[PDB]
Amino acid sequence: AELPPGRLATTEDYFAQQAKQAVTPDVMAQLAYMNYIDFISPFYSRGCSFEAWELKHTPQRVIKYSIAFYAYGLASVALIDPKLRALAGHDLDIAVSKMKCKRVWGDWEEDGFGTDPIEKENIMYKGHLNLMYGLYQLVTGSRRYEAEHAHLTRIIHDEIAANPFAGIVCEPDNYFVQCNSVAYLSLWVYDRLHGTDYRAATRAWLDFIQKDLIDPERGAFYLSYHPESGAVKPWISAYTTAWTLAMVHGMDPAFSERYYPRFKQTFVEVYDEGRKARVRETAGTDDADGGVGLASAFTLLLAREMGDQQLFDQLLNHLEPPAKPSIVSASLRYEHPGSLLFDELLFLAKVHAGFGALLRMPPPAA
Amino acid sequence: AELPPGRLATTEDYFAQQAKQAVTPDVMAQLAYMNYIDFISPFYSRGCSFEAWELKHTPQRVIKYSIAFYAYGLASVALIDPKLRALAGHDLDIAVSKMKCKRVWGDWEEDGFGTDPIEKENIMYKGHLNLMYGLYQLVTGSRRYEAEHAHLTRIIHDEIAANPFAGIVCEPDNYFVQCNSVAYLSLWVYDRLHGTDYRAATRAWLDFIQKDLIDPERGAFYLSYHPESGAVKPWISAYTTAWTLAMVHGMDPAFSERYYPRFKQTFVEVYDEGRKARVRETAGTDDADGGVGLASAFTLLLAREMGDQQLFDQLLNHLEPPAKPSIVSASLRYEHPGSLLFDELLFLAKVHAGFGALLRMPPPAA
Amino acid sequence: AELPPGRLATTEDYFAQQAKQAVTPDVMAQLAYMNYIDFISPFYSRGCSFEAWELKHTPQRVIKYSIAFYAYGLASVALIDPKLRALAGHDLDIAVSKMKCKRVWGDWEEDGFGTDPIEKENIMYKGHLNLMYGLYQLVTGSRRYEAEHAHLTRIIHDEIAANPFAGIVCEPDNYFVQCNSVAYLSLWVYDRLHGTDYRAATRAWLDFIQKDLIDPERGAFYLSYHPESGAVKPWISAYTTAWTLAMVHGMDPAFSERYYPRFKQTFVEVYDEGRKARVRETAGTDDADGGVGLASAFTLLLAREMGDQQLFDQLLNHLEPPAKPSIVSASLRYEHPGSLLFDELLFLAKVHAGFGALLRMPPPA
Amino acid sequence: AELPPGRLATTEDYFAQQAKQAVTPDVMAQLAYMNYIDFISPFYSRGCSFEAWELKHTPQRVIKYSIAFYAYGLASVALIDPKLRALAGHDLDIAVSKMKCKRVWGDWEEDGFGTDPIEKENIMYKGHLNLMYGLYQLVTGSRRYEAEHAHLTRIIHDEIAANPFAGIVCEPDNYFVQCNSVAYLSLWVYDRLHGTDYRAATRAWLDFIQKDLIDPERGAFYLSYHPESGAVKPWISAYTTAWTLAMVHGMDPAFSERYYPRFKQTFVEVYDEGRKARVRETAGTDDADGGVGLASAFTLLLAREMGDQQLFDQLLNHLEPPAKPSIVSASLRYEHPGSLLFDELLFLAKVHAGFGALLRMPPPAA
Amino acid sequence: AELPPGRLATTEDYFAQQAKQAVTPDVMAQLAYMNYIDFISPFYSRGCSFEAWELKHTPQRVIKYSIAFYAYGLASVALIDPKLRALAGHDLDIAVSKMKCKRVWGDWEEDGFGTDPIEKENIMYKGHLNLMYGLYQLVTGSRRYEAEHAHLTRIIHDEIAANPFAGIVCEPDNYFVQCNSVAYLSLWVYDRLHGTDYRAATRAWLDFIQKDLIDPERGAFYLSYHPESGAVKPWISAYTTAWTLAMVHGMDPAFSERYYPRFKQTFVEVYDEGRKARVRETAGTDDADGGVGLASAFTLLLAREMGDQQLFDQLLNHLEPPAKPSIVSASLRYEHPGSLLFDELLFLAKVHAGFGALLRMPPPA
Ligand SMILES: CC(C)=CCC/C(C)=C/CO
Ligand SMILES: CC(C)=CCC/C(C)=C/CO
Ligand SMILES: CC(C)=CCC/C(C)=C/CO
Ligand SMILES: C/C=C(\C)CCC=C(C)C
Ligand SMILES: C/C=C(\C)CCC=C(C)C
């Protein structure tokens, strides 16, 4: 009912978008920024131009994540607003297309790992690409990428089946649970589009991460796992855990509902007499948003995914006002974005319908 | 016949140039900037030198529109002032020559769309080039570019005939009505120069854009259309609409006269006790000249095409004085151009005799 | 014989140099700048090094004119001062050599016109180079460039013979009278060195520019002509006219004497109680030195060519004092040069013996 | 047991780490800086990415020593904390891997000395790489690099046998005793891993450096030796001596014990009432840390190797506090590092278990 | 007089180095700058690495002179201090090796003169290289470069034999007497090392420059000579003359002793109560160190060569203090070097034992 002094819309309105079958005016102004201006908007063209990311100063290694999080948000826009589904499909088509430019995956070759970014490992890239394939087809019904979707899904499936641990590495001896959660979710999307049972591998993965990679008492994942050396980095990560639990909640709700409360105790800091919240990146500090600086942003998505309106309001009251949003000519801009992936992650959280709902998204109007 | 500060000539003077068969002194001073100084004036050489555009900081993707709009203005100078027809012919020759330099069309290749900018799609470029081919021949009677004109017109004609929708896309699945209107307008020019009836396609296109791409109540076109996904971007665009209605008015005057009064109500903001006007780029905002920033400029051209002297005076009183024109050594310069393509569009609007009149331009000598 | 603030030597002194057989001390200090410091002075080396022009921030397209105007000044230096004739020859050799470096002519290729700078058109370049070939041979007696001189003179002669208009274009459909006057002057120099009569084409050319390209009432040429489209840019150009009249005065003095007074009335503004002058680039304006900014500089050369000491003094009182000349360690420098080609054009005007006098220059016997 | 101002932990705590089987909290925070943040931490990936060194402005020629000194510290972390041994192995794996990127060794080729950095000479590079091969196998027990280890050991051994002087040169005619001490130590590591007696060549080398390259009264080595001309640069070097004695102490302790007290008299300046010390780089000056600026840092390592807790405390009270250390989000940072290789050498000194102990390191098990 | 603010050691100390058989502490600190710090010191490595000159902002065309002048000083360090002779030998080895990198000679190819920097002309480069070959062999006794020394010495000797004038040019028609003086001096070095008599051509060269290239009244050489055009640049050059006289003094002492007094009258300006001196680069000015800015520095070398302790002290009192020397960690640095080649030339002048003394240098046997 109320509007904090730096907010564009209430938490109640964002949560009510799907019920009203319409996005809020500030979410529409974000779509305007994404689509409106010729040449320099990010979703103007399927070509290999990245002026939009250059204007925002996005580091090259992060463009792939920017594109993915836009894509995940567009999928929920499609489910929220039938009137906007066609735009979302058009944007997803451009997203898939840009995701394959060498400007996006080229770091894999620059680092010396090879010329093929999908053949082996590099799950940090092809996991998002594979999920984007499926989200696009669920939204649009187009089979444009169906051959490529089935190819990358088979590659992913075979790689899981061959590893003694459950899941896939990004680089040799570098295993990240959050990147695996994206890959497993893409098997569910494929199963939903086809008749397959690629998701059958999800059980062993949840068992594997639950006994080996998670601190059950604090409800937090460790930074990363290294199978060849049997090592686990001894720090628990807030941004890691929030992302993983958000995507897991769409495959196995009970799993994430068990750790979410313990997770909030470990990392979440409520302040300003309960009106604001910020998130510790790791244990043993009171500093907020260390490391990659995304603990608060990803926790905002997790609260949305978990339906935690109180924490969503508290995190947004910390994130948005200091970023100084403004709407000029019906288009959204942030003057002091507080982190990398800022407008992408706030966009995603405001519209996110939950990864489960995207799995059950209805077919298009044919 | 009053003259406010920063205006160089009255609106009555501009509208009376053709009856007097003489351009106004500030239009002559624009022609001096275009032609006078060795090396750095835009029309000094047919070679691939672009110092003039580098001096103005024209983004590379905009040079093709800068060249084209110069060309369209030069065609009207040819019709206005017989004494200048040879000079305008010479400039048109150089414009066509520069339009073919890689520095002008090269973005098509950088984005990954191919090595031939005219073979498929890319109507945003080859449409203007095709029109310039024809306008050059109407002014001069020279057949220098006649073969290329017949080749590109044939490509345009075949591409229209092959599409299930009426028109041609710029990029795969990106349809822009303003870019199609240039291509359709060029078919009429070819018909005037030869006996052809390539213009027969205009009926289907006017029916198509009227049923799918226009908001009949507000008289405004949507930003863009995307055939593959059947999507239409949900924003109406002033610069899209002003440009399209201006060009359609030379092919079907009744069409543009139908929506013009509603277009003005949707986009045009009169202020300063009726002496000035500025234009919204889209609905739902009071900010003027958002998006690419050309709404007021393109509405100035439309007012010229439509014979709306009052609106023309209001827009020029907003656009020109703040740009600080000065005439030094009989050459026109603006100290603070308010947008991209500024001196090009003000030049064009000041001389524009109407796209219908360019089509019905009398033949040259022999 | 008074010296205004900021002037280095009197107009009477510049005009008296040939009679005294010695250049003024400030012309000597300009040659010092041209020849003195290793590596960075413009006439240090025959190699393709251009440090001197980079230090001056000369636009690349303008380098060719810098070299050519230095050469024209060095040719008069040879005629003025026998003790300096050998040095002028050495400098002319360096000038010709640098003139052929790709850094000087390469714009012809960047602009997409081809890989050969002399084969066809481009008279703006090969015309100056052809004149420099001949002036070099006149100064030194050397035949080092005689072959290249005859080849390019034959190239020019043939291009004239083939055109329905009189002269040669720079780019297709770009005809510049000032660039043609350099080319025609080069035919007289070639004829003077040998016995030929290549200069016979000058009659048709002067007939052509007089009937089509000059406004006889105002004594001023239009900016340019464009044969293919039959167009003439409708602005009269002061720097075009001053340059063209100066060189024509060496081939047909009566021609330039007929228009010079009308040129002064059209473009020249005397001010400061008759002590200064500046030149409007075109009609219909009060601005001085618009366009390329060379109207006053070339009119200074024209006044020298015409023997107009009064106008020369007025123009130099406008051009030099604001540039703040100084002589440091016997070398000339300008703190605020007012235009492109500044030290080159003042150099040329101070020593210029007349293009006709250069044609009749005596051998180094 | 008292804590000097600006210090993070006591000298007693650093020295007590191995007995307590735990690193101090600031050493753990240094490991976090090395491992925590995606992409930009130094040991995130085995790829040829060097963002961490670009952020620190490390000169290209110094990257190889940065990696090596990190490696040596991680080896001691393996001995100190069994709980951290697997992570240390993982980091060592990444270290040798990064060590072989052209960005690290490429100066050998840019300087014109050849295309193969291990073929001949260049002991300043392959000496460290070879030691890293063996330390990785000592820590992890992996034979991953065993083949390359034996290849480079034979190269080194054969090069020693062929020279009339004892050792190997860096660039042609550039002999550096410190770079040789690294290679000889790698021969002992190979001997420990296998049965070999490659270390037998160490006797002739110790005799050679003792009669030709050291000033015996001042306990100091000369800058360098140049076999072709028989020349010895007539300056004694503190950083050269500190490094050489430290590594020699692991092969022949008696040698380093003999010169250490003379080295301290020659170069070390105690000040601030015995609470601090800094090191002169050469004789005949009172300036500290001239030349490469590493005399004090390397002497900190030597005091650690020699067990000199007093000098260690005095040097650390001089180096660390002014560098303004802080711990943010459980990660260590220095606001004003005082030299090259700053956090690398302080890290090594704080954990260093002694080069002899690294040789005698037990296998991983229990 | 004591030690003025900015002087590191007295002139008496520099002149006494050879008698004490030991360099001064500031000369040792210069060698430390040359040898101490890994990677960035100029003589760290024989490879084609030039960080040291990039840090000093040495223009590329001057690196070859920086290396040569370092080498000449290292030759004297070898002769002054036997304890440092092995070091000087090693540095000379590095000097020769770096002298052959394309970064040092590449200007010849960039300017368009060819791909071989020693084949023809370019005496400005191969002259210094040839002297360094020989100086290296005298200091060390090594034949490492002997073949190359014999080949370049034969190239130089043949080119002298073919020219109608005495000497070799740098570029076609660019003759510099100071660059010829390096080349002839290298012939004497070859004669001392072997039995040859290549130096016999020195006589014709001293006759030629004495009659054509020097103003005997002012004791000064003109800037340059141009055989093809018979030209001589009409300015006398202090830096040119000081250098030539210093090197000629080692081959024919009487020649330099005759012109030295007049050179001082022409160029040297004493001031500050006899405690300082600065040098005019050319006649007709009071500005010091015009042109390339090296007149005072080269005159410091000449005073050393001539044994003129008073002028040496006066020049050093002008050159060093303003450059703000300091010794940090036993290494010498100048905060405001006053010219190109600053620490190189002050280094050389402080140690220079005389070119004749280097010619008669004893072996290390
Ligand atoms: C800018 C200067 C000194 C001359 C212009 C000459 C010119 C542009 C001729 C046409 O090609
Ligand atoms: C930037 C300007 C003057 C117009 C935009 C034209 C455009 C990009 C149409 C779609 O292809
Ligand atoms: C500058 C640093 C950290 C070490 C010096 C090592 C070296 C240059 C050895 C000889 O090649
Ligand atoms: C291995 C995991 C990754 C590379 C994810 C990095 C995450 C962000 C937000 C840059
Ligand atoms: C031709 C002679 C030369 C190029 C020598 C130049 C001398 C200095 C000190 C730069």
**Distance (Å, rounded) from C-alpha D321 to C-alpha E343?**
38
> What is the three-class DSSP state of E335?
coil
Place of tokens 């735990």: D22
Neighbours of D157 (CB within 10 A): 18
C111, C228, C280 member nearest B47 (Cβ)? C111
Task: State the nearest Cα–Cα gap between A8 and chain B, in angstroms.
Answer: 16
The response to whether residue B263 sits with its C-beta less than 6 Å from ligand 2 reads no
A38 alpha carbon to ligand 2 midpoint, in Å? 6
Cβ contacts of residue E286 below 8 Å, gap of 6+?
E269, E280
Instruction: Categorise residue C173: left if φ over 0, alpha if ψ from -120 to 50, beta otherwise.
Output: left
Known binding-site positions of E: 170
Cα distances from E316 to residues E82, E277, E304, E312, in angstroms, run 26, 8, 11, 6
Asked if the Cβ–Cβ distance from C87 to E231 is below 8 Å, we say yes
Max CA separation in chain A (angstroms): 55
How determined? X-ray
**Element at E220 (helix H, strand E):** strand E220-221
A16 alpha carbon to ligand 3 midpoint, in Å? 65
**Distance (Å, rounded) from C-alpha C115 to C-alpha C107?**
10
User: B293 is written with which tokens?
Assistant: 């920033």
The response to whether residue E168 sits with its C-beta less than 6 Å from ligand 5 reads no
Among the bound ligands, the one closest to the CA of B342: 2
HSE, CB side, 13 Å, CA atoms: give it for residue A51. Answer: 17
Contacting chains of A (3 CB pairs or more, <8 Å) are B, D
CA nearest E100: which of E136, E55, E56, E141? E136
Place of tokens 């000064």: E220
Show the 3-state SS of chain C.
Answer: CCCCCCCCCCHHHHHHHHHHCCCCHHHHHHHHHHHCCCCCCCCCCCCCCCHHHHHCCCCHHHHHHHHHHHHHHHHHHHHHCHHHHHHHHHHHHHHHHHHCCHHHHCHHHHCCCCCCCCCCCCHHHHHHHHHHHHHHHHHHCCCCCHHHHHHHHHHHHHHHHHCCCCCCCCCCCCECHHHHHHHHHHHHHHHHHCCCCHHHHHHHHHHHHHHHHEECCCCEEECCEECCCCEECCCECHHHHHHHHHHHHHHCHHHHHHHHHHHHHHHEEEECCCCEEEECCCCCCCCCCCCCCCHHHHHHHHHHHHCCHHHHHHHHHHHCHHHCEEEECCEEEECCCCCCCHHHHHHHHHHCCCHHHHHCCCCCC
A35 alpha carbon to ligand 2 midpoint, in Å? 14
Place of tokens 């002064």: C264
Cα distances from B168 to residues B107, B196, B252, D52, in angstroms, run 19, 20, 20, 49
Q: Are E50 and E63 in contact (CB under 8 A)?
A: yes
D110, D231, D292 member nearest E37 (Cβ)? D292
What is the stated resolution of the deposited model, in angstroms? 2.5
**Distance (Å, rounded) from C-alpha A236 to C-alpha A281?**
8
**Distance (Å, rounded) from C-alpha B124 to C-alpha B122?**
5
For A31-56, give one letter per residue: b (16+ CB within 10 A) or e: bbbbbbbbeebbbbbbbbbbbbbeeb
Q: Are E264 and C303 in contact (CB under 8 A)?
A: no
Place of tokens 């307008």: B185
| Amino acid identity at D256 | S
Find the DSSP H helices in chain A: 11-20, 25-35, 51-56, 63-80, 85-99, 102-105, 107-110, 123-140, 146-162, 177-193, 202-212, 238-248, 253-267, 295-306, 309-323, 342-351, 355-359
* Residue C86 sits at the chain E interface (C-beta within 8 Å): yes
> What is the three-class DSSP state of E332?
strand
Q: Cα-flanking dihedrals φ and ψ of residue B334, to 5°?
A: -115, 130
Show the 3-state SS of chain D.
Answer: CCCCCCCCCCHHHHHHHHHHCCCCHHHHHHHHHHHCCCCCCCCCCCCCCCHHHHHHCCCHHHHHHHHHHHHHHHHHHHHHCHHHHHHHHHHHHHHHHHHCCHHHHCHHHHCCCCCCCCCCCCHHHHHHHHHHHHHHHHHHCCCCCHHHHHHHHHHHHHHHHHCCCCCCCCCCCCECHHHHHHHHHHHHHHHHHCCCCHHHHHHHHHHHHHHHHEECCCCEEECCEECCCCEECCCECHHHHHHHHHHHCCCCHHHHHHHHHHHHHHHEEEECCCCEEEEECCCCCCCECCCCCCHHHHHHHHHHHHCCHHHHHHHHHHHHHHHCEEEECCEEEECCCCCCCHHHHHHHHHHCCCHHHHHCCCCCCC
Cα distances from E340 to residues E292, E298, E312, in angstroms, run 8, 12, 19
Neighbours of E346 (CB within 10 A): 28
Cβ contacts of residue A272 below 8 Å, gap of 6+?
A317
> What is the three-class DSSP state of E216?
coil
Q: Are E153 and E190 in contact (CB under 8 A)?
A: yes
Place of tokens 């406010």: B4
Cβ contacts of residue D111 below 8 Å, gap of 6+?
D171, E45, E47, E48, E49
Residue numbers in B near C61 (CB within 8 A) = 39
Strand partners, C276: C271
Asked if the Cβ–Cβ distance from E93 to D281 is below 8 Å, we say no
Neighbours of C303 (CB within 10 A): 27
Helix axes E60-80, E123-140, angle to 10 degrees: 20
Angle CA C277–C279–C285, to nearest 5? 125
Asked if the Cβ–Cβ distance from D173 to E46 is below 8 Å, we say yes
Residue E276 DSSP label: E
Residue numbers in C near E235 (CB within 8 A) = 32, 36, 330
For B2-36, give one letter per residue: b (16+ CB within 10 A) or e: eeeeebbbbbebbeebbeeebbbebbbbbbbbbbb
Place of tokens 């500290």: D288
| Amino acid identity at C123 | I
User: B130 is written with which tokens?
Assistant: 């095709």
Cα distances from E93 to residues B119, E99, E140, in angstroms, run 64, 10, 9
Size (chain D), residues: 366
**Element at A271 (helix H, strand E):** strand A268-271
Cβ contacts of residue B98 below 8 Å, gap of 6+?
B46, B48, B50, B67, B104
Show the 3-state SS of A200-249.
Answer: HHHHHHHHHHHHHCEECCCCEEECCEECCCCEECCCECHHHHHHHHHHHC
The DSSP-derived string for A305-343 is: HHT-HHHHHHHHHHHHHHH-EEEETTEEEESS--STTHH
> What is the three-class DSSP state of E156?
helix
User: C115 is written with which tokens?
Assistant: 């890989």
**Element at A278 (helix H, strand E):** strand A276-279
The DSSP-derived string for E299-327 is: HHHHHHHHT-HHHHHHHHHHHHHHH-EEE
Q: Are C193 and C137 in contact (CB under 8 A)?
A: yes
E111, E235, E287 member nearest C45 (Cβ)? E111
**Distance (Å, rounded) from C-alpha A139 to C-alpha A362?**
8
Residue numbers in B near A140 (CB within 8 A) = 229
CA nearest C241: which of C274, C208, C287, C280? C280
**Distance (Å, rounded) from C-alpha C209 to C-alpha C58?**
31
**Element at E159 (helix H, strand E):** helix E146-162
**Element at E202 (helix H, strand E):** helix E202-212
User: E363 is written with which tokens?
Assistant: 């072996």
Residue numbers in B near A366 (CB within 8 A) = none
Q: Cα-flanking dihedrals φ and ψ of residue C204, to 5°?
A: -60, -35
**How do strand A331-334 and strand C276-279 relate by DSSP bridges?**
unpaired
User: C30 is written with which tokens?
Assistant: 């300009």
> What is the three-class DSSP state of A73?
helix
Burial class of D255 by CB neighbour count within 10 A (0 to 12, 13 to 18, 19+) = middle
For B50-75, give one letter per residue: b (16+ CB within 10 A) or e: bebbeebebeebbbbbbbbbbbbbbb
Angle CA D56–D59–D65, to nearest 5? 90
C37, C48, C84 member nearest E111 (Cβ)? C48
Cβ contacts of residue D57 below 8 Å, gap of 6+?
none
**Element at E35 (helix H, strand E):** helix E25-35
Q: Are C242 and C285 in contact (CB under 8 A)?
A: no
Instruction: Categorise residue E141: left if φ over 0, alpha if ψ from -120 to 50, beta otherwise.
Output: left
**Distance (Å, rounded) from C-alpha A237 to C-alpha A281?**
6
Nearest residue (CA) to ligand 2, atom 5: A38
- Which atom of ligand 3 lies at the shortest distance from residue D171's CA? 11
> What is the three-class DSSP state of E269?
strand
Residue E81 DSSP label: -
Cβ contacts of residue C185 below 8 Å, gap of 6+?
C131, C247, C250, C251, C355
CA nearest C190: which of C242, C245, C151, C144? C151
Neighbours of E208 (CB within 10 A): 16
Instruction: Categorise residue D57: left if φ over 0, alpha if ψ from -120 to 50, beta otherwise.
Output: left
E38 alpha carbon to ligand 3 midpoint, in Å? 6
Task: State the nearest Cα–Cα gap between C228 and chain B, in angstroms.
Answer: 8
Q: Where are the domains of chain B?
A: 1-366
**Distance (Å, rounded) from C-alpha D64 to C-alpha D107?**
11
**Distance (Å, rounded) from C-alpha B289 to C-alpha B281?**
5
Strand partners, C277: C270
**Distance (Å, rounded) from C-alpha D247 to C-alpha A321?**
57
User: E69 is written with which tokens?
Assistant: 């002048």
CA nearest D67: which of D28, D109, D100? D100
* Cα dihedral D353, D358, D362, D365 sign: positive
In C15-54, the residues whose Cβ lies within 8 Å of chain B are none
Strand partners, A37: none
Neighbours of D140 (CB within 10 A): 24
> What is the three-class DSSP state of A143?
coil
C275 alpha carbon to ligand 1 midpoint, in Å? 30
Task: State the nearest Cα–Cα gap between A291 and chain D, in angstroms.
Answer: 5
Burial class of A151 by CB neighbour count within 10 A (0 to 12, 13 to 18, 19+) = middle
Q: Are C230 and B86 in contact (CB under 8 A)?
A: yes
**Distance (Å, rounded) from C-alpha B143 to C-alpha B150?**
11
User: A342 is written with which tokens?
Assistant: 């800022």
The response to whether residue E38 sits with its C-beta less than 6 Å from ligand 3 reads yes
> What is the three-class DSSP state of A110?
helix
Place of tokens 């050599």: C97
Q: Are B188 and B209 in contact (CB under 8 A)?
A: no
Q: Are B340 and B62 in contact (CB under 8 A)?
A: yes
Place of tokens 């000015």: E285
Asked if the Cβ–Cβ distance from C229 to B49 is below 8 Å, we say no
Asked if the Cβ–Cβ distance from B328 to C287 is below 8 Å, we say yes
Show the 3-state SS of chain B.
Answer: CCCCCCCCCCHHHHHCHHHHCCCCHHHHHHHHHHHCCCCCCCCCCCCCCCHHHHHHCCCHHHHHHHHHHHHHHHHHHHHHCHHHHHHHHHHHHHHHHHHCCHHHHCHHHHCCCCCCCCCCCCHHHHHHHHHHHHHHHHHHCCCCCHHHHHHHHHHHHHHHHHCCCCCCCCECCEECHHHHHHHHHHHHHHHHHCCCCHHHHHHHHHHHHHHHCEECCCCEEECCEECCCCEECCCECHHHHHHHHHHHHHHCHHHHHHHHHHHHHHHEEEECCCCEEEEECCCCCCCECCCCCCHHHHHHHHHHHHCCHHHHHHHHHHHCHHHCEEEECCEEEECCCCCCCHHHHHHHHHHCCCHHHHHCCCCCCC
Q: Are B333 and B54 in contact (CB under 8 A)?
A: no
Residue E83 DSSP label: G
**Distance (Å, rounded) from C-alpha B340 to C-alpha B62?**
8
Place of tokens 């303008």: C62
Residue E106 DSSP label: T
CA nearest D70: which of D356, D351, D311? D351
